[PDB]
Design a protein around this nucleic acid. Structure first.
Ligand SMILES: Nc1nc2c(ncn2[C@@H]2O[C@H](COP(=O)(O)O)[C@@H](O)[C@H]2O)c(=O)[nH]1
Ligand SMILES: [Mg+2]
Ligand SMILES: [Mg+2]
Ligand SMILES: [Mg+2]
Ligand SMILES: [Mg+2]
Ligand SMILES: [Mg+2]
Ligand SMILES: [Mg+2]
Ligand SMILES: [Mg+2]
Ligand SMILES: [Mg+2]
Ligand SMILES: [Mg+2]
Ligand SMILES: [Mg+2]
Ligand SMILES: [Mg+2]
Ligand SMILES: [Mg+2]
Ligand SMILES: [Mg+2]
Ligand SMILES: [Mg+2]
Ligand SMILES: [Mg+2]
Ligand SMILES: [Mg+2]
Ligand SMILES: [Mg+2]
Ligand SMILES: [Mg+2]
Ligand SMILES: [Mg+2]
Ligand SMILES: [Mg+2]
Ligand SMILES: [Mg+2]
Ligand SMILES: [Mg+2]
Ligand SMILES: [Mg+2]
Ligand SMILES: [Mg+2]
Ligand SMILES: [Mg+2]
Ligand SMILES: [Mg+2]
Ligand SMILES: [Mg+2]
Ligand SMILES: [Mg+2]
Lengths: 95, 52, 354, 100, 31, 118, 110
RNA sequence: UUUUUUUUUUUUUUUUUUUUUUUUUUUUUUUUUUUUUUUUUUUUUUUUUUUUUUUUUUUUUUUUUUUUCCA
RNA sequence: UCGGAGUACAAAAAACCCUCCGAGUGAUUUUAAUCUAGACAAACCAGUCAAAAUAACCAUAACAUCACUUAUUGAUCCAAAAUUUUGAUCAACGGAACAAGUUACCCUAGGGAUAACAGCGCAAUCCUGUUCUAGAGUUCCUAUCGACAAUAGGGUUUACGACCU
RNA sequence: GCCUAACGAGCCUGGUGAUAGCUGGUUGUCCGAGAAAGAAUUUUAGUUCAACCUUAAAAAUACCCCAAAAACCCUAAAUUCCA
């Protein structure tokens, strides 16, 4: 991760995270299950459903992704017909 | 004894294919599977050979 | 570490040595019979019944009823043996049995069952349905005398009321007929009690028809304390139990506190407790007849609620407990995207400041 | 072949006395790796009875078995789980009959 | 459990001794 | 493996001579324990350390008063090799609210209510 | 050395919930490789011989008679070879329900 | 998709003097079949360029056997 | 690399160039779906179950079954697929897309974390004494030896350890 | 082998503040709490997590834990769960 760029001197971000991850405005990160497109005939139906289902990331991975990504991707986005607009916020979090 | 992986498509017209392991020294595979597109018990025949 | 068993072990009686000389059972049916026979014994270890409510195990039931009829056992056995020998002497019955073509006089079987062993079956059915648990709370009786209750749905349609049958308020709208064998020297009291349907007090039950001082079998000639009232079960909570109790009494019982008015449309006045009633009239009354049936809601209940009771119809519903969910975590790990939907207040997008 | 303490190795009988069998078995007992004696039924009974008498008339109120069972002074930290059964008479493969 | 008083309540292999998974060997040794 | 030590119930069965030897009442057991920590918890198991911590015996050679109930008797049995236990004696009875500031604890195991009168 | 491949992590096969624990539906009571604990009332049986509570309540463990399914040939043969006084006993795990099925609430007094 | 053997009388084996057993037809044997004895016909799957012969190499399809991708 | 047994005796886990079995798949039809509570296990990635509800068959089961059934298997990316999939002993098996030997002509930064010489621990090996007598010694165990065995001592050789450099 | 006193490939300058998981050093006072290792890795001379631990903030149950309970041929010290 380039903490200070050479041209503008800003902090860059790794494009792999934006390519294979999604950040909700609540701070959670969304990712796909590993191996959901490899050897489907060799796996059980329940295993295939688990692979196809989305999953979340824990605190350590979330902090790592936040460090590796700039503040642009942490903004609030109001997309037209965004499926994840419902999951953008968090409710009834008693902590 | 070597097995063969065969891709079989539905005969209901709808595009729906699934892979199955078969014995090489057997005839063309033709079974009854379940199609969720039409949600019916449909006849599936061997279409392609994918993996040896 | 080893500990001493707290009692005899199950398989410590049979000898391990010389199994070949010990007889075995080769039938799964025999093994099942033996296992079920042993499973009912009070074992010293933790069993299924103790944890799943064997109803406090043994219970010394107080008996409040007529004494059993005194029958000569030897003469009864001799007569039964003679009848069996006479039946077996016939060749036509044996031919029918061989040819698998035989019929049974079901009406006579029913009559004989009611005469000799019907009371015990009725008592155990009432115990299963919990009649004694809510009428006396500590006492179960034997319905010695029969009690035939019948509702008239028209001119040629008669609905019987057996022990646990289902009778709708449409058929139960009118006062039923009660039949029982009795000489012209005894007094009887009939009480129709609805165990389920009281809106306020769970521990109280309603009275629909209480008629006391019945000379013999003439139920009509007896004075009615409470006029007959059609059943009025709730639309939601269905299958209430209505029980006819018949008591035999010796003296001419007169009571002024339990007397009901002719209209008797007040639910406050139609509040009853069989325990207190039998406490009051324990000296003379002794229960001898019982006939309980189930009744659910129908269209006829609305008319009873509106015209008769002058009330609005209560509607209930069998609501289930909400599903259990663990405490929501700040960062759920390996959870599906739908994890946030499990704690959503409503399926409406909420915009805070925008 | 493993042999523990108190296990017989060779058992002899006949119409003979005890002196000669002891005399010609003491050499074998000495040549054996573990210490051994040429005993008889009477000798074994006598030694067991003497051991029981000593262990019952021992004067000091403190005994190894009592201390180990009661965990006095927290001695279980130093001791071994097998010591609860050995009662201080057995240490490794060595057995001392005079330790009660 | 081993320390529980109800230990060995399921002990059944001592009640049956027919555990010979051999093809056809016969004893033929009763003198 | 070194683990906790089970103590058989035979150890805590008093002999008739024990009462006379230790000056105890064979009929009525005493009411309160005075416990004093003699040895250190170093070179001792962590569960024993925790028991000594929860018993309030952090400071050695300082008596502490506890109940005579089996709930605390279990822990006292667990750490019995590190403490001295005496029965609390009340020759003058329980001190009242007017004698709380004039009480004292003699080393013999008794609690004097009136101490240093003038 | 000639021995190789013996190294393998344990499968954590054991009892998860002890007696007296208040569990919910779907909680795995215990995992096992062979049939050590048999399910009883309100306890299912997964295809991997796992035991999971079907209702919300209290877990209990009992010793109860064992009547095998008639289609299980080995079990039926063992039962038939058992002597006249022998009855098989197995350790069953049960869940005693606590929450009732439901309640009747007034929705509208019309 | 790639690698390799290939295409024989009507059926199988060889080899270049295209032969040897089955099958077919015409006779004989038998009361009639079957068995057996004679005679006959029966081919290099096709294109192209050749050798002394072609078992020289190439075009269109036919079954074919193996491989068909660690990540 | 993965699974079973003992080590690891009774909730779980637990290592060695520890002692043994195996696995890198076959055969058959009941061709075995969608969605979603709640749980096991786990650093993560992975692996496991699964109540209710839906589509097709009895209008009463569907967890595919068997071979000790536990292991029979592989994360990105990328290629070919064409609508939905497949995938090379990455076998060093959490894996770089593709890279061999020799240096006594060697160099550099370090290591007594790691060897050879020495020292030190132990005594497998070695050397000593004593105990035991069957046997040799013409008779006779101990004049001179003395097999099968026991106990104790020394640290000279090799080997083991890798504690000081 | 020799190529200006060091040649398995000369010397100077520039890249160059080359890079080092490796060695060495790291400069005032006092006070509080305070850690010996489970999993991966061209990895065991290091890193990345987990378990512990430190500064803050929220809460409420936390250790000891009587019974009872945890397998089937035999099995010790004792373990897990809870008043
Ligand atoms: N891993 C680990 N090392 C420790 C711990 N305490 C001390 N050390 C190490 O021990 C050395 C100092 O010894 P001490 O001064 O503690 O006797 C240092 O190398 C230090 O890093 C500990 O709790 N964990
Ligand atoms: Mg009789
Ligand atoms: Mg293992
Ligand atoms: Mg391991
Ligand atoms: Mg867990
Ligand atoms: Mg279901
Ligand atoms: Mg590697
Ligand atoms: Mg590796
Ligand atoms: Mg792994
Ligand atoms: Mg040279
Ligand atoms: Mg150097
Ligand atoms: Mg060293
Ligand atoms: Mg080291
Ligand atoms: Mg030297
Ligand atoms: Mg050396
Ligand atoms: Mg030196
Ligand atoms: Mg050595
Ligand atoms: Mg030595
Ligand atoms: Mg001689
Ligand atoms: Mg010796
Ligand atoms: Mg030396
Ligand atoms: Mg040397
Ligand atoms: Mg020079
Ligand atoms: Mg540097
Ligand atoms: Mg390194
Ligand atoms: Mg400090
Ligand atoms: Mg330290
Ligand atoms: Mg307990
Ligand atoms: Mg607790």
């Amino acid at each position: 991760v380039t903490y200070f760029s050479s041209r503008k001197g800003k902090r860059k971000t790794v494009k792999a995270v934006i390519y294979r991850f999604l950040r909700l405005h609540s701070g959670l990160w969304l990712r796909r299950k590993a191996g959901y497109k490899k050897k489907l005939w060799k796996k059980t139906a329940a295993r295939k459903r688990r692979l196809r289902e989305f999953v979340f990331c824990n605190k350590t991975q979330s902090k790592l992704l936040d460090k590796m990504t700039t503040s642009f991707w942490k903004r609030r986005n109001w997309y037209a017909d965004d499926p994840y607009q419902k999951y953008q916020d968090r409710t009834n979090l008693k902590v | 004894s070597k097995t063969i992986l065969v891709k079989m498509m539905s005969q209901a017209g709808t595009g729906f294919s699934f892979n199955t392991k078969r014995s090489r020294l057997r005839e063309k595979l033709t079974l009854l599977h379940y199609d969720p597109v039409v949600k019916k018990k449909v006849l599936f025949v061997e279409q392609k050979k994918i993996r040896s | 570490r080893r500990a001493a068993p707290l009692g005899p072990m199950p398989n410590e009686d049979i000898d391990v040595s010389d199994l070949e000389r010990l007889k075995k059972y080769r039938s799964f049916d025999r093994y099942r019979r033996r296992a079920e026979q042993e499973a009912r014994k009070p074992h010293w270890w933790r069993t299924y019944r103790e944890h799943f409510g064997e109803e406090s195990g043994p219970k010394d039931r107080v008996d409040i009823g007529l004494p059993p009829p005194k029958v000569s056992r030897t003469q009864q056995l001799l007569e039964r043996k003679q009848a069996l020998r006479e039946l077996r002497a016939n060749v036509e019955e044996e031919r029918a049995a061989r040819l698998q073509t035989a019929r049974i006089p079901l009406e006579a079987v029913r009559a004989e069952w009611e005469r000799t062993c019907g009371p015990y079956h009725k008592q155990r059915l009432a115990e299963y349905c919990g009649l004694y648990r809510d009428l006396f709370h500590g006492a179960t009786f034997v319905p010695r005398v029969p009690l035939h209750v019948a509702y008239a749905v028209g001119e040629d349609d008669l609905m019987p009321v057996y022990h646990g049958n289902e009778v709708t308020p449409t058929e139960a709208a009118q006062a039923p007929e009660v039949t029982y064998e009795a000489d012209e020297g005894s007094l009887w009291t009939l009480l129709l009690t609805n165990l389920d349907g009281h809106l306020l007090e769970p521990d109280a039950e309603y009275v629909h028809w209480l008629v006391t001082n019945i000379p013999g079998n003439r139920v009509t000639e007896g004075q009615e304390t409470c006029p007959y009232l059609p059943p009025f079960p709730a639309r939601g909570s269905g299958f209430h139990r209505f029980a006819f109790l018949l008591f035999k009494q010796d003296k001419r019982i007169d009571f002024s506190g339990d007397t009901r008015p002719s209209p008797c449309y007040q639910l406050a006045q139609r509040t009853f407790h069989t325990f207190d009633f039998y406490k009051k009239h324990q000296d003379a009354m002794t229960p001898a007849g019982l006939a309980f049936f189930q009744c659910r809601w129908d269209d006829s209940v609305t008319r009873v609620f509106h015209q008769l009771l002058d009330m609005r119809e209560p509607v209930f519903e069998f609501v289930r407990p909400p599903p259990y969910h663990p405490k929501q975590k700040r960062f759920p790990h390996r959870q599906p995207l739908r994890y946030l939907d499990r704690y959503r207040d409503s399926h409406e997008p909420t915009y805070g400041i925008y | 072949t493993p042999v523990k303490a108190g296990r017989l190795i060779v058992e002899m009988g006949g119409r003979c006395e005890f002196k000669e069998v002891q005399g010609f078995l003491d050499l074998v007992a000495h040549k054996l790796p573990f210490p051994a004696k040429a005993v008889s039924r009477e000798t074994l009974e006598k030694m067991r009875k003497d051991q029981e008498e000593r262990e019952r008339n021992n004067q000091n109120p403190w005994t190894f078995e009592r201390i180990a069972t009661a965990n006095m002074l927290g001695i279980r930290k130093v001791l071994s789980p097998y010591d609860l059964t050995h009662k201080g008479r057995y240490w490794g493969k060595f057995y001392t009959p005079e330790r009660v | 459990y081993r320390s529980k008083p109800t230990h060995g309540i399921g002990r059944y292999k001592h009640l049956v001794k027919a555990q010979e998974p051999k093809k056809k060997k016969g004893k033929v040794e009763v003198r | 493996k070194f683990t906790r030590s089970r103590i058989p119930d035979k150890v805590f069965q008093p002999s008739p001579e024990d009462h006379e030897k230790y000056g105890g009442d064979p009929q009525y057991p005493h009411k309160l324990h005075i416990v004093t920590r003699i040895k250190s918890t170093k070179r001792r198991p962590y569960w024993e350390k925790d028991i000594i911590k929860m018993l309030g015996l952090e400071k050695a050679h300082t008596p502490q008063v506890h109940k005579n109930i089996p709930s605390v008797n279990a822990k006292l049995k667990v750490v019995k090799h590190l403490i001295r236990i005496k029965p609390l004696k009340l020759p003058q009875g329980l001190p009242t609210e007017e004698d709380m500031a004039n009480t004292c604890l003699k080393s013999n195991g008794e609690l004097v209510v009136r101490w240093l009168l003038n | 050395s000639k021995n190789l491949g013996g190294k393998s992590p344990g499968k954590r096969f054991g009892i998860k919930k002890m007696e007296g624990h208040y569990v919910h539906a779907g909680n795995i009571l215990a995992t096992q490789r062979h049939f050590r604990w048999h399910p009883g009332a309100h306890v299912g049986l997964g295809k991997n011989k796992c035991l999971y509570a079907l209702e919300e309540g209290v877990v209990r463990y009992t010793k109860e008679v064992y009547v095998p399914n008639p289609s299980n040939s080995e079990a039926v043969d063992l039962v038939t070879r058992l002597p006249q006084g022998a009855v098989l006993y197995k350790t069953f795990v049960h869940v005693v329900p606590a929450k009732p099925e439901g309640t009747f609430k007034l929705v509208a007094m019309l």
